Design an enzyme around this catalytic site. Structure first.
Site, mmCIF file in Angstrom:
data_model
loop_
_atom_site.group_PDB
_atom_site.id
_atom_site.type_symbol
_atom_site.label_atom_id
_atom_site.label_comp_id
_atom_site.label_asym_id
_atom_site.label_seq_id
_atom_site.Cartn_x
_atom_site.Cartn_y
_atom_site.Cartn_z
ATOM 1 N N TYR A 47 48.982 48.127 44.050
ATOM 2 C CA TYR A 47 47.990 47.479 43.134
ATOM 3 C C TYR A 47 48.670 47.109 41.810
ATOM 4 N N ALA A 103 46.932 45.119 27.779
ATOM 5 C CA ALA A 103 45.787 45.615 28.557
ATOM 6 C C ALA A 103 46.193 45.760 30.027
ATOM 7 N N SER A 123 42.072 47.494 27.657
ATOM 8 C CA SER A 123 41.308 46.776 28.716
ATOM 9 C C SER A 123 39.808 46.867 28.430
ATOM 10 N N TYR A 153 36.704 40.509 28.294
ATOM 11 C CA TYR A 153 36.188 39.489 29.233
ATOM 12 C C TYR A 153 34.797 39.100 28.740
ATOM 13 N N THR A 162 40.472 37.225 27.307
ATOM 14 C CA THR A 162 41.226 36.804 28.511
ATOM 15 C C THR A 162 40.484 35.624 29.133
ATOM 16 N N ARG A 192 45.772 39.070 45.609
ATOM 17 C CA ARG A 192 46.920 40.018 45.773
ATOM 18 C C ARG A 192 46.927 40.554 47.210
ATOM 19 N N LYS A 244 44.029 34.900 25.358
ATOM 20 C CA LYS A 244 45.019 35.481 26.285
ATOM 21 C C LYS A 244 44.981 34.740 27.614
ATOM 22 N N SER A 274 50.500 33.969 28.575
ATOM 23 C CA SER A 274 50.343 34.939 29.670
ATOM 24 C C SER A 274 49.953 34.224 30.965
ATOM 25 N N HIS A 319 49.037 36.509 33.239
ATOM 26 C CA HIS A 319 48.342 37.743 33.676
ATOM 27 C C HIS A 319 49.299 38.551 34.570
ATOM 28 N N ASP A 366 53.551 37.741 27.130
ATOM 29 C CA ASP A 366 53.740 38.826 28.124
ATOM 30 C C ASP A 366 54.181 38.191 29.436
ATOM 31 N N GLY A 420 52.981 45.208 30.181
ATOM 32 C CA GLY A 420 51.905 45.707 31.051
ATOM 33 C C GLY A 420 52.421 46.801 31.945
ATOM 34 N N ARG A 421 53.053 46.406 33.023
ATOM 35 C CA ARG A 421 53.489 47.352 34.082
ATOM 36 C C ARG A 421 54.368 48.482 33.539
HETATM 37 N N1 LIG Z 1 35.642 55.487 30.241
HETATM 38 S S1 LIG Z 1 34.420 54.281 30.265
HETATM 39 O O1 LIG Z 1 33.084 54.875 30.178
HETATM 40 O O2 LIG Z 1 34.404 53.455 29.047
HETATM 41 C C1 LIG Z 1 34.574 53.225 31.749
HETATM 42 C C2 LIG Z 1 34.777 51.872 31.479
HETATM 43 C C3 LIG Z 1 34.920 50.990 32.526
HETATM 44 C C4 LIG Z 1 34.827 51.470 33.816
HETATM 45 C C5 LIG Z 1 34.968 50.459 34.939
HETATM 46 C C6 LIG Z 1 33.956 49.296 34.726
HETATM 47 C C7 LIG Z 1 34.009 48.335 35.707
HETATM 48 C C8 LIG Z 1 34.876 48.329 36.833
HETATM 49 C C9 LIG Z 1 34.487 48.967 38.008
HETATM 50 C C10 LIG Z 1 35.330 48.927 39.114
HETATM 51 C C11 LIG Z 1 36.564 48.262 39.047
HETATM 52 F F1 LIG Z 1 37.315 48.298 40.200
HETATM 53 C C12 LIG Z 1 36.965 47.604 37.846
HETATM 54 C C13 LIG Z 1 38.193 46.888 37.691
HETATM 55 C C14 LIG Z 1 39.406 47.554 37.672
HETATM 56 C C15 LIG Z 1 40.630 46.875 37.512
HETATM 57 C C16 LIG Z 1 40.658 45.485 37.386
HETATM 58 O O3 LIG Z 1 41.944 44.879 37.251
HETATM 59 C C17 LIG Z 1 42.054 43.804 36.348
HETATM 60 N N2 LIG Z 1 41.207 43.429 35.389
HETATM 61 N N3 LIG Z 1 41.734 42.365 34.749
HETATM 62 N N4 LIG Z 1 42.941 42.115 35.333
HETATM 63 C C18 LIG Z 1 43.137 42.956 36.301
HETATM 64 C C19 LIG Z 1 44.352 43.044 37.185
HETATM 65 O O4 LIG Z 1 44.440 43.997 38.069
HETATM 66 O O5 LIG Z 1 45.291 42.165 37.045
HETATM 67 C C20 LIG Z 1 39.436 44.797 37.435
HETATM 68 C C21 LIG Z 1 38.210 45.499 37.566
HETATM 69 C C22 LIG Z 1 36.102 47.660 36.747
HETATM 70 N N5 LIG Z 1 33.114 47.409 35.420
HETATM 71 N N6 LIG Z 1 32.447 47.741 34.280
HETATM 72 C C23 LIG Z 1 31.523 46.890 33.809
HETATM 73 N N7 LIG Z 1 30.195 46.936 33.796
HETATM 74 C C24 LIG Z 1 29.571 45.873 33.270
HETATM 75 C C25 LIG Z 1 28.054 45.722 33.138
HETATM 76 O O6 LIG Z 1 27.561 44.564 33.324
HETATM 77 O O7 LIG Z 1 27.344 46.732 32.827
HETATM 78 C C26 LIG Z 1 30.365 44.843 32.819
HETATM 79 S S2 LIG Z 1 31.970 45.369 33.121
HETATM 80 C C27 LIG Z 1 32.935 48.887 33.799
HETATM 81 C C28 LIG Z 1 32.364 49.472 32.465
HETATM 82 C C29 LIG Z 1 32.969 48.600 31.322
HETATM 83 C C30 LIG Z 1 32.267 48.693 29.963
HETATM 84 C C31 LIG Z 1 32.155 47.412 30.778
HETATM 85 C C32 LIG Z 1 34.619 52.803 34.123
HETATM 86 C C33 LIG Z 1 34.489 53.702 33.076
HETATM 87 F F2 LIG Z 1 34.283 55.014 33.404
HETATM 88 C C1 LIG Z 2 47.902 46.927 36.744
HETATM 89 C C2 LIG Z 2 47.448 45.850 35.764
HETATM 90 C C3 LIG Z 2 46.199 45.862 35.214
HETATM 91 C C4 LIG Z 2 45.831 44.824 34.339
HETATM 92 N N1 LIG Z 2 44.609 44.818 33.750
HETATM 93 C C5 LIG Z 2 44.288 43.883 32.861
HETATM 94 C C6 LIG Z 2 42.998 43.895 32.149
HETATM 95 O O1 LIG Z 2 42.227 44.831 32.350
HETATM 96 N N2 LIG Z 2 42.716 42.893 31.308
HETATM 97 C C7 LIG Z 2 43.580 41.866 31.060
HETATM 98 O O2 LIG Z 2 43.302 40.932 30.233
HETATM 99 N N3 LIG Z 2 44.781 41.816 31.680
HETATM 100 C C8 LIG Z 2 45.181 42.766 32.537
HETATM 101 N N4 LIG Z 2 46.431 42.716 33.137
HETATM 102 C C9 LIG Z 2 47.338 41.643 32.719
HETATM 103 C C10 LIG Z 2 48.175 42.273 31.589
HETATM 104 O O3 LIG Z 2 47.417 42.384 30.381
HETATM 105 C C11 LIG Z 2 49.471 41.523 31.231
HETATM 106 O O4 LIG Z 2 49.206 40.137 31.113
HETATM 107 C C12 LIG Z 2 50.591 41.723 32.243
HETATM 108 O O5 LIG Z 2 50.715 43.099 32.727
HETATM 109 C C13 LIG Z 2 51.890 41.277 31.586
HETATM 110 O O6 LIG Z 2 52.935 41.183 32.510
HETATM 111 P P1 LIG Z 2 53.925 42.456 32.831
HETATM 112 O O7 LIG Z 2 53.134 43.405 33.750
HETATM 113 O O8 LIG Z 2 55.054 41.803 33.627
HETATM 114 O O9 LIG Z 2 54.330 43.126 31.525
HETATM 115 C C14 LIG Z 2 46.801 43.724 34.029
HETATM 116 C C15 LIG Z 2 48.039 43.728 34.629
HETATM 117 C C16 LIG Z 2 48.369 44.738 35.461
HETATM 118 C C17 LIG Z 2 49.710 44.746 36.094
#
Ligand SMILES: NS(=O)(=O)c1ccc(Cc2c(-c3ccc(F)c(-c4ccc(Oc5[nH]nnc5C(=O)O)cc4)c3)nn(-c3nc(C(=O)O)cs3)c2CC2CC2)cc1F
Ligand SMILES: Cc1cc2nc3c(=O)[nH]c(=O)nc-3n(C[C@H](O)[C@H](O)[C@H](O)COP(=O)(O)O)c2cc1C
Length: 335
Positions: free
Chosen positions: A27, A80, A109, A133, A159, A168, A208, A230, A232, A263, A286-287
Protein backbone atom coordinates in the site's frame (compact mmCIF):
# COMPACT_ATOMS: atom_id res chain seq x y z
CA UNK A 1 23.66 2.58 16.50
CA UNK A 2 20.26 0.65 16.34
CA UNK A 3 20.15 -2.58 14.18
CA UNK A 4 20.00 -3.41 11.40
CA UNK A 5 22.48 -0.65 10.41
CA UNK A 6 20.51 1.75 8.10
CA UNK A 7 22.57 4.60 6.59
CA UNK A 8 20.28 5.92 3.79
CA UNK A 9 16.57 6.21 3.01
CA UNK A 10 16.63 3.12 0.66
CA UNK A 11 17.89 1.07 3.71
CA UNK A 12 14.75 2.24 5.67
CA UNK A 13 12.53 1.02 2.77
CA UNK A 14 14.34 -2.41 2.59
CA UNK A 15 13.87 -2.79 6.40
CA UNK A 16 10.13 -1.86 6.09
CA UNK A 17 9.58 -4.53 3.36
CA UNK A 18 11.16 -7.13 5.77
CA UNK A 19 8.92 -6.30 8.84
CA UNK A 20 5.54 -4.95 7.44
CA UNK A 21 2.73 -7.34 6.36
CA UNK A 22 2.90 -7.55 2.49
CA UNK A 23 -0.46 -5.75 1.97
CA UNK A 24 0.74 -2.79 4.20
CA UNK A 25 4.21 -2.49 2.54
CA UNK A 26 2.53 -2.77 -0.95
CA UNK A 27 0.00 0.00 0.00
CA UNK A 28 2.85 2.38 1.04
CA UNK A 29 5.25 1.42 -1.88
CA UNK A 30 2.71 1.42 -4.78
CA UNK A 31 2.38 3.83 -7.71
CA UNK A 32 -0.59 3.88 -10.13
CA UNK A 33 -1.02 1.26 -12.92
CA UNK A 34 2.41 0.34 -14.50
CA UNK A 35 4.29 2.74 -12.09
CA UNK A 36 5.94 4.68 -14.99
CA UNK A 37 5.82 8.02 -13.03
CA UNK A 38 6.94 6.17 -9.80
CA UNK A 39 10.23 5.09 -11.52
CA UNK A 40 10.58 8.56 -13.20
CA UNK A 41 10.12 10.62 -9.94
CA UNK A 42 13.48 9.01 -8.91
CA UNK A 43 15.15 8.63 -12.37
CA UNK A 44 14.45 12.30 -13.30
CA UNK A 45 16.58 13.57 -10.36
CA UNK A 46 19.61 11.55 -11.75
CA UNK A 47 19.25 13.32 -15.16
CA UNK A 48 19.71 16.78 -13.50
CA UNK A 49 23.52 17.16 -13.13
CA UNK A 50 25.22 19.35 -10.48
CA UNK A 51 27.90 22.00 -11.34
CA UNK A 52 29.66 22.58 -7.98
CA UNK A 53 31.49 25.87 -7.25
CA UNK A 54 34.95 25.31 -5.65
CA UNK A 55 36.72 27.54 -3.03
CA UNK A 56 33.54 29.30 -1.66
CA UNK A 57 34.17 28.72 2.10
CA UNK A 58 31.69 26.13 3.52
CA UNK A 59 33.10 26.00 7.11
CA UNK A 60 29.70 27.09 8.45
CA UNK A 61 26.60 25.73 6.67
CA UNK A 62 23.20 27.11 7.57
CA UNK A 63 20.28 25.00 6.25
CA UNK A 64 17.58 27.33 7.77
CA UNK A 65 14.84 28.82 5.58
CA UNK A 66 11.16 29.74 5.85
CA UNK A 67 7.94 28.12 4.56
CA UNK A 68 4.90 30.47 4.11
CA UNK A 69 6.52 33.04 6.49
CA UNK A 70 7.45 30.51 9.26
CA UNK A 71 11.13 29.66 10.06
CA UNK A 72 12.32 26.02 9.58
CA UNK A 73 15.69 24.35 10.35
CA UNK A 74 15.94 22.94 6.78
CA UNK A 75 14.05 23.01 3.45
CA UNK A 76 12.90 19.40 4.08
CA UNK A 77 9.40 18.90 5.57
CA UNK A 78 7.04 15.98 6.24
CA UNK A 79 4.27 15.54 3.59
CA UNK A 80 0.76 14.20 4.31
CA UNK A 81 0.71 10.37 4.39
CA UNK A 82 -2.58 8.68 5.52
CA UNK A 83 -2.60 5.65 7.91
CA UNK A 84 0.74 6.21 9.74
CA UNK A 85 -0.70 4.04 12.59
CA UNK A 86 -0.37 1.00 10.21
CA UNK A 87 3.44 1.67 10.32
CA UNK A 88 3.77 2.29 14.09
CA UNK A 89 1.31 2.41 17.08
CA UNK A 90 2.33 6.10 17.74
CA UNK A 91 1.63 7.03 14.06
CA UNK A 92 1.24 10.84 13.54
CA UNK A 93 2.06 11.56 17.27
CA UNK A 94 5.56 10.00 16.68
CA UNK A 95 5.90 12.04 13.41
CA UNK A 96 5.03 15.46 14.90
CA UNK A 97 7.39 14.82 17.89
CA UNK A 98 10.29 14.10 15.41
CA UNK A 99 9.37 17.30 13.47
CA UNK A 100 9.41 19.29 16.78
CA UNK A 101 12.92 17.86 17.57
CA UNK A 102 14.23 18.67 14.01
CA UNK A 103 12.64 22.20 13.90
CA UNK A 104 10.84 21.33 10.57
CA UNK A 105 7.12 21.31 9.64
CA UNK A 106 4.62 18.47 9.45
CA UNK A 107 1.74 18.43 6.91
CA UNK A 108 -1.05 16.34 8.60
CA UNK A 109 -3.39 14.18 6.36
CA UNK A 110 -7.06 15.38 6.56
CA UNK A 111 -7.82 11.67 7.44
CA UNK A 112 -4.89 10.89 9.80
CA UNK A 113 -5.26 8.05 12.39
CA UNK A 114 -4.73 10.97 14.95
CA UNK A 115 -6.99 14.08 15.41
CA UNK A 116 -5.88 17.70 14.71
CA UNK A 117 -6.10 18.33 18.50
CA UNK A 118 -4.07 15.14 19.46
CA UNK A 119 -1.23 16.13 17.04
CA UNK A 120 -1.19 19.74 18.36
CA UNK A 121 -0.92 18.30 21.96
CA UNK A 122 1.92 15.89 20.98
CA UNK A 123 3.76 18.71 19.10
CA UNK A 124 2.68 22.05 20.60
CA UNK A 125 5.98 23.74 19.44
CA UNK A 126 6.12 21.91 16.04
CA UNK A 127 5.36 23.88 12.84
CA UNK A 128 2.09 22.13 11.75
CA UNK A 129 0.00 22.42 8.55
CA UNK A 130 -3.28 20.69 7.60
CA UNK A 131 -3.68 18.85 4.30
CA UNK A 132 -7.36 19.25 3.26
CA UNK A 133 -9.64 17.40 0.87
CA UNK A 134 -12.87 19.24 -0.08
CA UNK A 135 -15.33 16.54 1.03
CA UNK A 136 -18.83 16.27 -0.50
CA UNK A 137 -19.77 17.18 3.10
CA UNK A 138 -18.58 20.86 3.21
CA UNK A 139 -19.63 21.05 6.92
CA UNK A 140 -16.87 18.56 7.97
CA UNK A 141 -14.43 20.29 5.51
CA UNK A 142 -15.16 23.66 7.30
CA UNK A 143 -14.82 22.02 10.79
CA UNK A 144 -11.30 20.64 9.93
CA UNK A 145 -10.20 24.17 8.84
CA UNK A 146 -11.69 25.78 12.04
CA UNK A 147 -9.99 23.06 14.21
CA UNK A 148 -6.65 23.78 12.37
CA UNK A 149 -6.96 27.57 12.94
CA UNK A 150 -7.90 26.92 16.61
CA UNK A 151 -5.08 24.34 17.27
CA UNK A 152 -2.28 26.65 15.96
CA UNK A 153 -1.76 25.11 12.43
CA UNK A 154 -0.12 27.68 10.07
CA UNK A 155 -1.47 26.66 6.62
CA UNK A 156 -3.94 24.54 4.56
CA UNK A 157 -2.56 22.34 1.75
CA UNK A 158 -5.63 21.66 -0.43
CA UNK A 159 -5.08 18.48 -2.47
CA UNK A 160 -6.61 18.94 -5.96
CA UNK A 161 -5.35 15.79 -7.82
CA UNK A 162 -7.57 13.12 -6.13
CA UNK A 163 -11.20 13.62 -7.29
CA UNK A 164 -11.06 9.78 -7.33
CA UNK A 165 -8.28 7.40 -6.11
CA UNK A 166 -5.61 6.18 -8.58
CA UNK A 167 -5.61 2.48 -9.59
CA UNK A 168 -2.85 0.84 -7.42
CA UNK A 169 -2.68 -2.75 -8.76
CA UNK A 170 -1.10 -4.38 -5.61
CA UNK A 171 -3.92 -2.93 -3.40
CA UNK A 172 -6.53 -4.56 -5.76
CA UNK A 173 -4.57 -7.90 -5.79
CA UNK A 174 -4.13 -7.85 -1.96
CA UNK A 175 -7.84 -6.89 -1.43
CA UNK A 176 -6.44 -3.94 0.66
CA UNK A 177 -10.03 2.09 -0.47
CA UNK A 178 -11.02 3.57 -3.95
CA UNK A 179 -14.76 3.04 -3.10
CA UNK A 180 -14.33 4.83 0.28
CA UNK A 181 -12.38 7.79 -1.23
CA UNK A 182 -15.18 8.04 -3.88
CA UNK A 183 -17.83 8.16 -1.04
CA UNK A 184 -16.06 11.06 0.83
CA UNK A 185 -14.07 13.21 -1.70
CA UNK A 186 -16.04 15.58 -3.98
CA UNK A 187 -15.09 15.04 -7.66
CA UNK A 188 -17.25 18.04 -8.78
CA UNK A 189 -14.86 20.67 -7.25
CA UNK A 190 -13.72 23.60 -9.49
CA UNK A 191 -11.96 26.99 -9.07
CA UNK A 192 -15.31 28.21 -7.58
CA UNK A 193 -14.70 25.85 -4.59
CA UNK A 194 -11.15 27.34 -4.29
CA UNK A 195 -12.79 30.85 -4.09
CA UNK A 196 -14.98 29.42 -1.28
CA UNK A 197 -11.96 28.02 0.69
CA UNK A 198 -9.96 31.27 0.08
CA UNK A 199 -12.92 33.19 1.74
CA UNK A 200 -13.42 30.53 4.52
CA UNK A 201 -9.92 31.00 6.09
CA UNK A 202 -7.15 33.66 6.38
CA UNK A 203 -4.58 30.83 6.78
CA UNK A 204 -2.04 30.58 3.92
CA UNK A 205 -3.42 28.09 1.30
CA UNK A 206 -1.18 25.92 -0.92
CA UNK A 207 -2.62 24.05 -3.94
CA UNK A 208 -1.17 20.53 -3.74
CA UNK A 209 -0.88 18.48 -6.91
CA UNK A 210 -0.41 21.13 -9.67
CA UNK A 211 1.64 19.99 -12.71
CA UNK A 212 0.60 22.65 -15.35
CA UNK A 213 1.83 26.29 -15.68
CA UNK A 214 -1.72 27.52 -16.57
CA UNK A 215 -3.20 25.89 -13.38
CA UNK A 216 -0.38 27.45 -11.27
CA UNK A 217 -1.30 30.89 -12.67
CA UNK A 218 -5.01 30.19 -11.94
CA UNK A 219 -3.91 29.38 -8.30
CA UNK A 220 -2.07 32.78 -8.00
CA UNK A 221 -5.13 34.60 -9.56
CA UNK A 222 -7.42 33.00 -6.87
CA UNK A 223 -5.29 34.48 -4.00
CA UNK A 224 -3.55 31.18 -3.09
CA UNK A 225 -0.18 31.50 -1.28
CA UNK A 226 1.77 28.48 -2.64
CA UNK A 227 2.03 25.68 -5.21
CA UNK A 228 3.08 22.16 -4.14
CA UNK A 229 4.29 20.57 -7.43
CA UNK A 230 3.12 16.99 -6.77
CA UNK A 231 1.91 13.90 -8.69
CA UNK A 232 0.79 12.49 -5.27
CA UNK A 233 3.89 10.18 -5.12
CA UNK A 234 2.95 8.84 -8.62
CA UNK A 235 -0.20 7.18 -7.02
CA UNK A 236 -2.87 9.05 -9.07
CA UNK A 237 -2.49 9.53 -12.87
CA UNK A 238 0.35 7.29 -14.20
CA UNK A 239 2.38 8.77 -17.12
CA UNK A 240 2.50 12.33 -15.79
CA UNK A 241 6.02 13.80 -15.67
CA UNK A 242 8.41 13.62 -12.67
CA UNK A 243 7.85 16.62 -10.33
CA UNK A 244 11.56 17.70 -10.69
CA UNK A 245 10.99 17.95 -14.51
CA UNK A 246 7.80 20.19 -14.31
CA UNK A 247 9.09 22.32 -11.30
CA UNK A 248 10.99 24.84 -13.53
CA UNK A 249 7.96 25.45 -15.82
CA UNK A 250 5.76 26.06 -12.67
CA UNK A 251 8.42 28.36 -11.08
CA UNK A 252 8.58 30.35 -14.41
CA UNK A 253 4.73 30.39 -14.67
CA UNK A 254 4.20 32.00 -11.19
CA UNK A 255 6.84 34.85 -11.67
CA UNK A 256 7.77 34.80 -7.91
CA UNK A 257 4.19 35.63 -6.75
CA UNK A 258 3.94 32.48 -4.54
CA UNK A 259 6.33 29.93 -3.02
CA UNK A 260 6.69 26.73 -5.07
CA UNK A 261 7.35 23.42 -3.23
CA UNK A 262 8.08 19.92 -4.57
CA UNK A 263 7.37 16.32 -3.52
CA UNK A 264 7.76 12.97 -5.30
CA UNK A 265 10.98 10.92 -5.26
CA UNK A 266 13.02 12.92 -2.67
CA UNK A 267 15.33 10.25 -1.15
CA UNK A 268 18.79 11.99 -0.92
CA UNK A 269 20.38 15.32 0.00
CA UNK A 270 21.25 15.97 -3.72
CA UNK A 271 17.50 15.67 -4.60
CA UNK A 272 16.79 18.57 -2.14
CA UNK A 273 19.69 20.64 -3.62
CA UNK A 274 18.47 20.01 -7.24
CA UNK A 275 14.87 21.11 -6.35
CA UNK A 276 16.05 24.36 -4.64
CA UNK A 277 18.46 25.06 -7.60
CA UNK A 278 15.34 24.87 -9.85
CA UNK A 279 13.45 27.36 -7.57
CA UNK A 280 11.58 25.23 -4.98
CA UNK A 281 11.48 26.91 -1.52
CA UNK A 282 11.34 23.49 0.17
CA UNK A 283 10.61 19.83 -0.50
CA UNK A 284 8.25 17.39 1.17
CA UNK A 285 8.90 13.70 1.82
CA UNK A 286 6.11 11.10 1.99
CA UNK A 287 7.25 7.48 1.95
CA UNK A 288 10.64 8.00 3.77
CA UNK A 289 8.68 9.12 6.92
CA UNK A 290 6.54 5.92 6.83
CA UNK A 291 9.73 3.79 6.48
CA UNK A 292 11.04 5.74 9.52
CA UNK A 293 7.87 4.90 11.55
CA UNK A 294 8.11 1.21 10.45
CA UNK A 295 11.73 1.04 11.76
CA UNK A 296 11.28 2.78 15.21
CA UNK A 297 8.36 5.22 15.49
CA UNK A 298 9.48 8.72 16.59
CA UNK A 299 13.27 7.89 16.57
CA UNK A 300 12.92 6.27 13.08
CA UNK A 301 11.28 9.42 11.69
CA UNK A 302 13.93 11.58 13.44
CA UNK A 303 16.67 9.29 11.84
CA UNK A 304 15.20 9.67 8.29
CA UNK A 305 14.91 13.48 8.70
CA UNK A 306 18.50 13.66 10.17
CA UNK A 307 19.86 11.55 7.27
CA UNK A 308 18.23 13.91 4.72
CA UNK A 309 19.42 16.93 6.75
CA UNK A 310 23.13 15.82 6.83
CA UNK A 311 23.11 14.54 3.18
CA UNK A 312 21.71 17.97 2.23
CA UNK A 313 24.34 19.78 4.36
CA UNK A 314 27.15 17.81 2.68
CA UNK A 315 25.67 18.32 -0.84
CA UNK A 316 25.48 22.10 -0.10
CA UNK A 317 29.07 22.13 1.24
CA UNK A 318 30.59 20.11 -1.66
CA UNK A 319 28.77 22.44 -4.13
CA UNK A 320 30.06 25.73 -2.54
CA UNK A 321 26.73 26.79 -0.89
CA UNK A 322 27.09 28.12 2.72
CA UNK A 323 23.27 28.67 2.95
CA UNK A 324 20.09 28.25 0.77
CA UNK A 325 20.15 31.95 -0.44
CA UNK A 326 23.20 31.22 -2.68
CA UNK A 327 21.63 28.07 -4.33
CA UNK A 328 21.10 29.23 -7.99
CA UNK A 329 19.92 27.72 -11.33
CA UNK A 330 23.59 27.63 -12.58
CA UNK A 331 24.15 24.74 -10.07
CA UNK A 332 22.14 22.36 -12.36
CA UNK A 333 21.69 21.46 -16.10
CA UNK A 334 19.42 18.66 -17.49
CA UNK A 335 21.23 15.75 -19.29
N1 LIG B 1 -7.72 9.97 14.96
S1 LIG B 1 -9.10 10.61 14.16
O1 LIG B 1 -10.27 10.63 15.04
O2 LIG B 1 -8.99 12.05 13.88
C1 LIG B 1 -9.46 9.69 12.62
C2 LIG B 1 -9.43 10.46 11.46
C3 LIG B 1 -9.66 9.86 10.25
C4 LIG B 1 -9.96 8.52 10.22
C5 LIG B 1 -10.23 7.90 8.86
C6 LIG B 1 -11.35 8.71 8.14
C7 LIG B 1 -11.68 8.21 6.90
C8 LIG B 1 -11.09 7.08 6.26
C9 LIG B 1 -11.62 5.81 6.49
C10 LIG B 1 -11.05 4.72 5.84
C11 LIG B 1 -9.96 4.89 4.97
F1 LIG B 1 -9.49 3.74 4.39
C12 LIG B 1 -9.42 6.19 4.73
C13 LIG B 1 -8.33 6.46 3.85
C14 LIG B 1 -7.05 6.04 4.17
C15 LIG B 1 -5.95 6.30 3.33
C16 LIG B 1 -6.12 6.98 2.12
O3 LIG B 1 -4.96 7.18 1.32
C17 LIG B 1 -4.83 8.42 0.67
N2 LIG B 1 -5.50 9.56 0.89
N3 LIG B 1 -5.03 10.50 0.05
N4 LIG B 1 -4.04 9.92 -0.68
C18 LIG B 1 -3.92 8.67 -0.33
C19 LIG B 1 -2.93 7.68 -0.88
O4 LIG B 1 -2.88 6.47 -0.38
O5 LIG B 1 -2.15 8.04 -1.84
C20 LIG B 1 -7.42 7.39 1.78
C21 LIG B 1 -8.51 7.14 2.65
C22 LIG B 1 -10.00 7.27 5.40
N5 LIG B 1 -12.63 8.97 6.39
N6 LIG B 1 -12.97 9.95 7.27
C23 LIG B 1 -13.89 10.85 6.91
N7 LIG B 1 -15.16 11.02 7.27
C24 LIG B 1 -15.82 12.02 6.67
C25 LIG B 1 -17.27 12.40 6.94
O6 LIG B 1 -17.98 12.78 5.96
O7 LIG B 1 -17.72 12.36 8.14
C26 LIG B 1 -15.13 12.74 5.72
S2 LIG B 1 -13.56 12.04 5.69
C27 LIG B 1 -12.20 9.85 8.36
C28 LIG B 1 -12.36 10.89 9.52
C29 LIG B 1 -11.67 12.19 9.02
C30 LIG B 1 -12.04 13.47 9.78
C31 LIG B 1 -12.54 13.28 8.36
C32 LIG B 1 -10.00 7.72 11.35
C33 LIG B 1 -9.75 8.31 12.57
F2 LIG B 1 -9.80 7.50 13.68
C1 LIG C 1 1.22 6.00 1.92
C2 LIG C 1 0.82 7.39 1.43
C3 LIG C 1 -0.26 8.04 1.94
C4 LIG C 1 -0.59 9.31 1.43
N1 LIG C 1 -1.64 10.01 1.94
C5 LIG C 1 -1.91 11.24 1.51
C6 LIG C 1 -2.99 12.05 2.09
O1 LIG C 1 -3.62 11.58 3.04
N2 LIG C 1 -3.25 13.25 1.58
C7 LIG C 1 -2.53 13.79 0.54
O2 LIG C 1 -2.77 14.95 0.08
N3 LIG C 1 -1.52 13.09 -0.02
C8 LIG C 1 -1.17 11.87 0.41
N4 LIG C 1 -0.10 11.18 -0.16
C9 LIG C 1 0.68 11.88 -1.18
C10 LIG C 1 1.84 12.53 -0.39
O3 LIG C 1 1.39 13.67 0.34
C11 LIG C 1 3.04 12.98 -1.24
O4 LIG C 1 2.58 13.70 -2.38
C12 LIG C 1 3.93 11.84 -1.71
O5 LIG C 1 4.17 10.82 -0.69
C13 LIG C 1 5.25 12.44 -2.18
O6 LIG C 1 6.03 11.51 -2.86
P1 LIG C 1 7.13 10.56 -2.07
O7 LIG C 1 6.32 9.45 -1.38
O8 LIG C 1 7.93 9.96 -3.22
O9 LIG C 1 7.91 11.41 -1.08
C14 LIG C 1 0.22 9.91 0.33
C15 LIG C 1 1.28 9.20 -0.19
C16 LIG C 1 1.59 7.99 0.32
C17 LIG C 1 2.74 7.24 -0.23
Amino acid sequence: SMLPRLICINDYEQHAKSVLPKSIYDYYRSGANDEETLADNIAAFSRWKLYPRMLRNVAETDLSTSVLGQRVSMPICVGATAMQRMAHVDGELATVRACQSLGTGMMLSSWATSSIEEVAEAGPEALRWLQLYIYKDREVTKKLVRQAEKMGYKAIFVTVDTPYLGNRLDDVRNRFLAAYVAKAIDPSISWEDIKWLRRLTSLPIVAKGILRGDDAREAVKHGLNGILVSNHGARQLDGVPATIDVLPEIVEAVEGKVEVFLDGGVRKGTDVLKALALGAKAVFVGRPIVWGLAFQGEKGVQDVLEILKEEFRLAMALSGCQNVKVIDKTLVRKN
